[PDB]
């Protein structure tokens, strides 16, 4: 396992431990959990890119103690 990041506007982040090989629909559930927002109201990015489902963190190069940084975009309902 590794240690990653998710930072939000709000300087209220989030510190996960996951593997390489796990899909960004892992790590969005996990947002989910901590901070309630769905997966389709996540837009999680890393280094410019918008993370996708289906790709795994090693797609992306996200490497012990990277940070993602996630912005909330509200679509379809709100929870």
Known sequence: ????????????????????????????????????????????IFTGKKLEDGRTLSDYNIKFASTLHLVIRLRGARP
Do not use: H, Y
């Not at 431990?17 to 899909?23: K, L, R």
């Not at 996990?30 to 999680?44: A, H, M, V, Y």
């Open 1 to 44: 396992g590794m240690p990653i990041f998710v930072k939000t506007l709000t300087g209220k982040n989030i510190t996960l431990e996951v593997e390489p090989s796990d899909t960004i629909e892992n790590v969005k559930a996990k947002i989910q959990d901590k901070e309630g927002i769905p997966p389709d109201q996540q837009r999680l």
